[PDB]
Amino acid sequence: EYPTVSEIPVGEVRLYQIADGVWSHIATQSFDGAVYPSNGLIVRDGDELLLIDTAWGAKNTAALLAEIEKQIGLPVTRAVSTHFHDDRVGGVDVLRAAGVATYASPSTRRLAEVEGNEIPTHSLEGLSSSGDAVRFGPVELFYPGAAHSTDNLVVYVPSASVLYGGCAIYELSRTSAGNVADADLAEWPTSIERIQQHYPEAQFVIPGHGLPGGLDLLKHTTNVVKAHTNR
């Protein structure tokens, strides 16, 4: 079964095989007085691994690398951060020290710098406008437009029909919105529909936090977002 927040002590990381060559990584961290789980992705990239997102902090990201080496044993050579918050770039300095080449969009790099967060080294070109998509090894990066944040990316693994939504997509169980400080509530439903439009064949959908689902997570998130702007 997918690991839940109460089963992962802060500082530990779990791996979860989603499909051949595709794992999520799961960690936990404190935020405003509570502990929350957080997902990222790992995708076989030939003889190497591509990492999507840190494990939310330096200590968790070190545990991520150790668990990867223990369970998969291929080198993590590149990482992409899907937006500028700490659950996506916190730990970039650990990855860099470990030899990983770190990447994000120019928007993400700039917003991390304004925020005082860790800044991935390399800029991802070709993602500046809503609906842009670029191929990055075994995945497609896609900018659906502003949502949870103005810079948030999603990631699709074509060989497996896995859609990693990051923080723009909520888990089913979640019925309220919290941490919409940086969000574009008015644009968010339309960005979700841009994802639905571009990835209608997605078999697995991973939210930034919580249990995986299918495309039903998309409409569910819209409802939760719309519920917030009607009150």
Which CB, 48 or 187, lies closer to ligand 5YT?
187
Check binding of 178 to ligand 5YT (CB under 6 A). yes
Burial of 104 (0-12, 13-18, 19+ CB in 10 A): buried
3-state class of 52 per DSSP? strand
Catalytic residue among 83, 86, 117, 151: 83
Q: Does 165 bind ligand 5YT (CB under 6 A)?
A: no
Write down the least CB distance from residue 57 to ligand 5YT, Å. 10
Which residue among 85, 109, 194, 220 contacts Zn ion (CB under 5 A)?
85
How far apart CA 65 and CA 129 sit, in angstroms, is 32
Tell me if 155 sits within 8 A of 164, measured CB to CB.
yes
Contact 155, 53 (CB under 8 A): no
- DSSP symbol at 5: G
- Could you confirm whether 83 is annotated as catalytic? yes
Q: Which stretch binds ligand 5YT (CB under 6 A): 31-39, 43-51, 61-69, 211-219?
A: 31-39
CA 197 to chain centre: 19
User: Closest distance between Zn ion and the C-beta of residue 164, in Å?
Assistant: 13
Nearest-angstrom CA–CA distance, 51 and 68 = 10
Residue 36 interacting partner from ligand 5YT, Zn ion, none (CB closer than 5 to 8 Å by kind)? ligand 5YT
Query: What is the β-pairing status of strands 101-104 and 76-80?
Result: parallel
Q: Which range, of 30-38, 93-101, 127-135, 213-221, touches ligand 5YT by CB under 6 A?
A: 30-38
Return the number of the residue (95 or 169) whose C-beta is nearest ligand 5YT. 169
| Burial class of residue 206, CB neighbours in 10 A (0-12, 13-18, 19+) | buried
Which of 87, 117, 152, 182 is flagged as catalytic? 87
3-state secondary structure of 226: helix
Choose, by CB under 6 A, the member of 130, 179, 190, 196 that binds ligand 5YT: 179
Residue whose CB is nearest to Zn ion in the complex, by number: 85
Tokens of 72: 């998969």
Closest CB 75 distance from ligand 5YT, rounded Å: 27
**Residues at the contact surface with Zn ion, assessed by CB under 5 A:** 85, 87, 167, 208
Residues known to be catalytic: 83, 85, 87, 148, 179
